[PDB]
Structures are given as structure tokens and as C-alpha cells.
């Protein structure tokens, strides 16, 4: 409340640490369905069904230009990429499996880097 704050958690390294996590996501071998935006002219259904499309390259541009107010907004965009993938692809597909693997990989790095 007014003039009463919890102790200040140090957030001065967060920009650089999110950048590293993203770099490792980008270089993983199962990253290929997620490196560029889904092509909305060539993938019937995608535009109407997926209300907020997201991908690594778009996350990378937002990060580099100060469009994330804090580390939680960054994690929300990362999770959106895999939530969209689950919405559109069957679990028993290569892209479906790539998504489950990448989300597991992300959530470990997130815990270990910050918690």
C-alpha cells in the first residue's frame, strides 16, 4: 500500500536472461515449426481459428525494441506459441510433438533461471 513496499527483487538482468533463453529455444532442433509466423494466406483455417498468432521471430523483435514491460509478459508470449500449436495440430503429429517438447524445455529453463 502507500509508503509500504515488500523488498525490491533485482530485475536489472532480466532483459539479458530472457534473451538467452530465447537464443536456446531458437537453436533447438524441434524449433522449426516455431521460427517464423504461420503463413496465413497458405494455411486454410489458421487466420479464423487462431486469434493471436505468435512465433519466436516476433518474440525476438518485441524483446529487442522494449515491447515487454516485464518478465511475465515475455513468458506469456512464449506459452502462447505452444497453446496455439496445441489448438491447431493433433498430438500425434510431428508438429504436435515438437510443441510438447519445446514447452517442456522452456518451462525448465524458466524455473532454473529465475525461481
Amino acid at each position: 500500500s502507500m509508503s509500504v513496499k515488500k523488498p525490491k527483487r533485482d530485475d536489472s538482468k532480466d532483459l539479458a536472461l530472457c534473451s538467452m533463453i530465447l537464443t536456446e529455444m531458437e537453436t533447438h532442433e524441434d524449433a522449426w515449426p516455431f521460427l517464423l509466423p504461420v503463413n496465413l494466406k497458405l494455411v486454410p483455417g489458421y487466420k479464423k481459428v487462431i486469434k493471436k498468432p505468435m512465433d519466436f521471430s516476433t518474440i525476438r523483435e518485441k524483446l529487442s525494441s522494449g515491447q515487454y514491460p516485464n518478465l511475465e509478459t515475455f513468458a506469456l508470449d512464449v506459452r502462447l506459441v505452444f497453446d496455439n500449436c496445441e489448438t491447431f495440430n493433433e498430438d500425434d503429429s510431428d508438429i504436435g510433438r515438437a510443441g510438447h517438447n519445446m514447452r517442456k524445455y522452456f518451462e525448465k529453463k524458466w524455473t532454473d533461471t529465475f525461481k
Side-chain angles (χ1 to χ4, degrees), residues 1-7 9-12 14-114:
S1 87
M2 193 175 349
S3 309
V4 177
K5 286 311 154 327
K6 291 197 195 51
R9 185 212 163 246
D10 182 19
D11 66 353
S12 58
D14 282 357
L15 186 54
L17 292 158
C18 288
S19 180
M20 269 183 39
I21 290 172
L22 187 55
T23 290
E24 298 161 18
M25 282 209 303
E26 294 169 333
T27 71
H28 194 301
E29 75 165 296
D30 298 345
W32 58 266
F34 314 113
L35 297 171
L36 301 176
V38 174
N39 179 328
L40 299 172
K41 296 173 202 289
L42 306 180
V43 182
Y46 206 82
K47 193 181 203 301
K48 180 68 179 262
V49 174
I50 302 290
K51 304 295 171 195
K52 287 176 70 185
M54 189 59 53
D55 67 287
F56 297 164
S57 74
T58 300
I59 293 168
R60 177 62 79 197
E61 186 54 47
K62 288 177 69 164
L63 193 60
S64 292
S65 55
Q67 292 184 73
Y68 294 118
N70 63 57
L71 86 175
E72 302 308 333
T73 57
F74 167 83
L76 284 170
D77 266 353
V78 179
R79 292 167 184 143
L80 176 61
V81 168
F82 307 130
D83 293 349
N84 289 346
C85 183
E86 277 195 59
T87 293
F88 208 85
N89 299 259
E90 275 293 353
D91 289 348
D92 174 32
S93 61
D94 294 91
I95 288 180
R97 279 185 280 282
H100 286 295
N101 293 349
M102 294 296 308
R103 177 193 302 270
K104 186 78 174 175
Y105 194 71
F106 165 62
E107 293 301 348
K108 174 73 156 53
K109 302 269 182 189
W110 187 252
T111 294
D112 292 0
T113 304
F114 291 114

